[PDB]
Each structure stands twice: as structure tokens, then as C-alpha cells.
């Protein structure tokens, strides 16, 4: 039955990614006085299927200068980790219940970076190398702030167990307790997924296509799916951490729905930001994350360490 | 007679400094732009449902060329060749002979739509309103050779779009 | 072993997608198509040439900052001790030292590039 659970957590996520592509296109269109995909299927509902079939029926090209092994391993690592980072998510019950699921998520994200690195390096192109170096610089800028903010907001949780987040927020969303950390975490998640004002690894208007410039057909589809799956997963993480939802143990559907709606709202805000701001310069991205967030993240880490002790509100260990 | 963009110093009042700090920390202008594009989200999109809906056009539109005929049914083209002489792209090729009736009728009237600049100079130079850029603009072909129009192609085009071409001439000839 | 099963399933699914991608479509390859992309023109030099990092110091310090983040992770459990005074003083000491290192790097123009 566990294999059935694995399939019921992977296939629906891939379908959600496929339709999130269409949702993003239509949202951008309607925010640009346009109409998203509207011909292929009713209201464009068949566009993702057409895109997938085109990509997987498209000839994939293997660059002559490319290192084949890494060039093929990178896409696999990207998708596998994108699908794996959903394993510990509590909705309301996690598939795999870890005492340290949060650190597992951090480690899985840190590994996913190497997909962009190796894809860029192995592509053996100047634009791909620039994209890989930009990914390196991006992960240099956000990782420390990401971990510090996550630690500070989990100091009121009592452990790194993700399921406990539901209990901690049983009377109040944790965003009412750490909204500056919430803002900084949201921006860090934007930077991490190579997303709005931080689309520097891909850089459509500056690097043609970034690290995936030499990728076509299937592998390109896998990188896109991994990117959007990471988007949805990170938005789900933001939902569980700050926007807690009521969980009736006898009717888990209530939580599931509330959770899904919050994640959808966060993804829609991701697209909203994508169609509202110009792109950063990765020098400015690193300067922001190192000189405006990091000092403030350290200060708020001090504050959230001292607060439970000074208010006698240390959360339970178990 | 001139204006200074920028060149505006900020007030350093404690209230103004606090407002600027709040803008910096709480991202007020970013939320302002977010609200702007959110408002644009709920607008009605300006898309038209092509090909079921077609964009606005005017009687002066310069589209596919066509050789018109007199109400009698005879060609208006009397082979004066000044439409060929005025064509800035030298797309028109004209050869003429005295027809069996003895009239000035072209034997060859070839225009390569692949060289024409759709300037209209041809329809403006013609003294008998024979060559006329009609209203058709959707005549894309799968091969290059189909765009090298013959006299037969133009005559056929004229007979097909005459009703519309005439109506457009009637609507616009007073401005010409 | 369940986590191993999940990892195996994900890896197998990804590799199967790769296999289908590389064996379903009709393949027609020639030298020009597989050439590196340089916006339509031939590249001048190799892409494996040195690429200078203008933020090398930032990375070397990000190493130690990641170290400090590793040191700070046990904090949620550290609050469960009876010596809250000593624990709090040591945690604030580590955070103060991290801030001091950041400040030293900032003032000595280390966070700047080039």
C-alpha cells in the first residue's frame, strides 16, 4: 500500500505542475490585458498535455562539446529531488514522518542546486557556464538567511518535526508572530527557486536561456517540471510554516483543502510578482541578501531565542 | 520652456524620514505596483477572437493587388506602363501589343508580391483606376512561386474582390 | 527503508522519463546542429576557460557562515535545559560573534565585488 501512496504523491504533483504552467500563462495574460491559452481545449485546459507531448516527441540534441554523463544526470537529480521534497510535507499526515524533516528539506534543496551547476557546467557553453556561476552566487546569498529564518521561526515549534507546526498554530497563524521573518523567508524562497526578480540562472532577457540553453525536448521538460514542482513545494512549506490551518483528526479533508488553497494563493502571488517587477542584478541580489536580510535575520534570531525564555513560553520538546 | 525631471530633494522631517523608512522596510511601492497589476488582472482583456473576430480596417487599406474592369466587363488597363515606372521596388513587369480590336491591352502584367513594398504608388499613378491594392491581406502561400502573380492572377483577384474594391473606391475617391 | 523506496521510485521515474525522451522521438543529428550555441555565431574561445569570481571572498566567508548555521541548529533542543542563563548567554555570544564577523567583512570592504 506504501507504493500506492508514493504514486498518489508523485503523479498528482506532476499533473499539478503541468496545469500550473497553464495557470501561470493565463494569469500573466490577464494581468497583461491578454488571454492565456484559450484555443487548445476548453479555456486552454489541454495546453499542458500538448506541450508535454510536443516536448517528448521533439528530438533531443546531445551537444558535441558536452559531457554526456553529467548532462544526463543533472535533469534526473533535479526532478528526483523535486519529487522527493514532497515526501515529508504534513498534509495533514506526512508520507514519511521524520523528526528532522526540516533539515531534510534544507539538504534536499542544497543538493538540487548541483542540478543547475552540472547542467550548466556539462552543457559546455558560455551562457550555460554563466548561468551555473549565477546559480552558485544565488545559493551563496540566500542559504544562510534561509536557514537562520527557518531556525528562528522553528524556535517557537520546539523541534524540526514538520507535523508539530500544525499544533503550534492551533489558535493563531505563526505569521502573526514572525511577519518580518515571513517576508524575508518569502523573498528567500523567491530567490531559491530561481523565480521572480531572481530569475538569474535562466535570465531569458540576458542569458537567452541560462543554464538550460543547450537542453531540448525531454530534458528541458524535466527541468521545467522540477522548477515548478520546487515552486509548489516551497509555497507549501511557506503555507504550513506561517499560514497554519485547522486540522480535525476525524476529517483530515478540511486541512487538506485549507492547505491546498493557501498553497495555490502563494503560487498565484509568485506569478503575480513575476509579472510585476523587473529582474534584479545578481550583484544586487547578493548585496541585498547579505546586507539587508542577514543582519536583520541575525537580530531576529537573537530576538526569537531570547523571547521564549524572557516570556516563559518555551515550546515542548516532544 | 524646459522642465527638470528628478532634481527634487527629500524633506528630512522626522515624520518624512519615518515614512521613507517604512517604505524601505515594508516595501510600500512594491505593494503599490502589485496592486496596479492586480487591478489590471480584473480588467477586460483586449484580445479579439481571430479569425472569428477581425481587427478594424479602413477603405484606404493597401492589401493584395487586383486589376479592375469597366462596368462593360472590359479591362481598364490601357498599358500606359506608368504604374510600372512609379513602382519603387520595380515589381511590375508589363508587355503590351495592339490587340485584335486594336486597343491598348497588356499581354503581360506580372507583379511579384515578394518584391512589392505595398506602397500604393501603383494605384495612385494609374489614370483609369485599373491596378488597385484591394482589401485582402490574408493570402499567405506555402511556396515562393505562388507570390509571383500573373496577369491572370490579378484579373481573377479583381473579379473576386470587385464588389468590395468598388465600395472602397466609392468611399474614398473624394479624398484622392 | 520507506525513504529508500521513495528515493528509488523517484530516481527510476526520472530516468524512465529520460529514456523515453531519448528513444521515442525521431532522431536526425549532424555536426552543425550539435555545435555549441553562441547566439548564431561561432564561439571564439572554449567554455572550459577560467571564469574569474568577483565574489570569491563572499564564498569563502559563506563557508564559515554555513559553519555557524550548523552550530546554531541545535538551539531548539538547547532551550530545554535547566541552565537557561548559560545557554542564552552562549547562544547570544555565538550570534554576536557572527554579527561581528559580518561587520568586520562589511567595513573592510569584503562584501564588495571585484
Amino acid at each position: 500500500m506504501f507504493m500506492i501512496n508514493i504514486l498518489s504523491l508523485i503523479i498528482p504533483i506532476l499533473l499539478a505542475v503541468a496545469f500550473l504552467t497553464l495557470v501561470e500563462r493565463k494569469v500573466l495574460g490577464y494581468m497583461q490585458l491578454r488571454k492565456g491559452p484559450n484555443v487548445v481545449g476548453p479555456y486552454g485546459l489541454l495546453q499542458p498535455i500538448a506541450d508535454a507531448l510536443k516536448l517528448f516527441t521533439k528530438e533531443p540534441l546531445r551537444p558535441a562539446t558536452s559531457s554526456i554523463s553529467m548532462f544526463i544526470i543533472a535533469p534526473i537529480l533535479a526532478l528526483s529531488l523535486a519529487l522527493t521534497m514532497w515526501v515529508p510535507l504534513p498534509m495533514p499526515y506526512p508520507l514519511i514522518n521524520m523528526n528532522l524533516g526540516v533539515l531534510f528539506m534544507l539538504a534536499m534543496s542544497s543538493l538540487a542546486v548541483y542540478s543547475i551547476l552540472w547542467s550548466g557546467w556539462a552543457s559546455n557553453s558560455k551562457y550555460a557556464l554563466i548561468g551555473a556561476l549565477r546559480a552558485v552566487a544565488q545559493t551563496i546569498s540566500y542559504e544562510v538567511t534561509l536557514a537562520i529564518i527557518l531556525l528562528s521561526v522553528l524556535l517557537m515549534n520546539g523541534s524540526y518535526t514538520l507535523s508539530t507546526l500544525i499544533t503550534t498554530q492551533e489558535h493563531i497563524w505563526m505569521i502573526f508572530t514572525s511577519w518580518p521573518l515571513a517576508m524575508m523567508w518569502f523573498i528567500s524562497t523567491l530567490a531559491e527557486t530561481n523565480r521572480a526578480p531572481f530569475d538569474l540562472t535562466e535570465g531569458e532577457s540576458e542569458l537567452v536561456s541560462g543554464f538550460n540553453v543547450e537542453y531540448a525536448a525531454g530534458p528541458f521538460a524535466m527541468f521545467f517540471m522540477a522548477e515548478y514542482a520546487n515552486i509548489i513545494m516551497m509555497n507549501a512549506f511557506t503555507a504550513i510554516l506561517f499560514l497554519g490551518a485547522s486540522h480535525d483528526p476525524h476529517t483530515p479533508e478540511l486541512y487538506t483543502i485549507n492547505f491546498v488553497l493557501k498553497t495555490l494563493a502563494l503560487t498565484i502571488t509568485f506569478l503575480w510578482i513575476r509579472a510585476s517587477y523587473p529582474r534584479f542584478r545578481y550583484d544586487q541580489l547578493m548585496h541585498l541578501l547579505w546586507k539587508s536580510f542577514l543582519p536583520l535575520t541575525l537580530a531576529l534570531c537573537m530576538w526569537h531565542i531570547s523571547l521564549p525564555i524572557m516570556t516563559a513560553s518555551i515550546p515542548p520538546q516532544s | 520652456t524646459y522642465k527638470f525631471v528628478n532634481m527634487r530633494e527629500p524633506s528630512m522631517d522626522m515624520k518624512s524620514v519615518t515614512d521613507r523608512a517604512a517604505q524601505t522596510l515594508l516595501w510600500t511601492e512594491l505593494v503599490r505596483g502589485l496592486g496596479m497589476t492586480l487591478s489590471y488582472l480584473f480588467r477586460e482583456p483586449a484580445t479579439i477572437n481571430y479569425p472569428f473576430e477581425k481587427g478594424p480596417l479602413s477603405p484606404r487599406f493597401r492589401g493584395e493587388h487586383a486589376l479592375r474592369r469597366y462596368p462593360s466587363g472590359e479591362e481598364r488597363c490601357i498599358a500606359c506602363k506608368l504604374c510600372e515606372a512609379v513602382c519603387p521596388a520595380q515589381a511590375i513587369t508589363i508587355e503590351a501589343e495592339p490587340r485584335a480590336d486594336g486597343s491598348r491591352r497588356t499581354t503581360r502584367y506580372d507583379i511579384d508580391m515578394t518584391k512589392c513594398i505595398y506602397c500604393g504608388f501603383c494605384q495612385e499613378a494609374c489614370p483609369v483606376d485599373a491596378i488597385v491594392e484591394g482589401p485582402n491581406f490574408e493570402f499567405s502561400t506555402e511556396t515562393h512561386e505562388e507570390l509571383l502573380y500573373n496577369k491572370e492572377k490579378l484579373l481573377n483577384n479583381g473579379d473576386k474582390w470587385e464588389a468590395e474594391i468598388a465600395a472602397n473606391i466609392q468611399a474614398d475617391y473624394l479624398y484622392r | 527503508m520507506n525513504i529508500m523506496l521513495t528515493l528509488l521510485t523517484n530516481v527510476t521515474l526520472a530516468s524512465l522519463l529520460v529514456l523515453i525522451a531519448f528513444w521515442l522521438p525521431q532522431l536526425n543529428a549532424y555536426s552543425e546542429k550539435t555545435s555549441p550555441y553562441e547566439c548564431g555565431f561561432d564561439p571564439m574561445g572554449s567554455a572550459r576557460l577560467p571564469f574569474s569570481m568577483k565574489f570569491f571572498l563572499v564564498a569563502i566567508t559563506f563557508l564559515l557562515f554555513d559553519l555557524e548555521i550548523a552550530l546554531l541548529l541545535p538551539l531548539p533542543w538547547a532551550s530545554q535545559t535547566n541552565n537557561l542563563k548559560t545557554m542564552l548567554t552562549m547562544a547570544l555570544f555565538l550570534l554576536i560573534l557572527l554579527a561581528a564577523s559580518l561587520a568586520y567583512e562589511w567595513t573592510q570592504k569584503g562584501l564588495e565585488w571585484a
Binding site: 546586507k291 539587508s292 543582519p295 536583520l296 537580530a299 537573537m302 530576538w303 | 521613507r20 | 554579527a99
Partner: peptide, 26 residues
């Protein structure tokens, strides 16, 4: 005198650091 000028200037040019030192100090 000098403190007020410094703090007003600090929160006018670098308001981020002013909050961080205040939060850290508390």
C-alpha cells in the same frame, strides 16, 4: 545632540541596520 543627529541620519540612510541593532540590543 550628536546622538540625535546620528540616529536621524542612520534611520534616513540605512534604516535596516537601525532596526537590527535595536532588535538585537533588546
Amino acid at each position: 545632540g550628536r546622538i540625535a543627529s546620528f540616529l536621524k541620519n542612520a534611520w534616513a540612510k540605512e534604516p535596516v541596520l537601525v532596526a537590527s541593532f535595536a532588535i538585537g540590543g533588546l
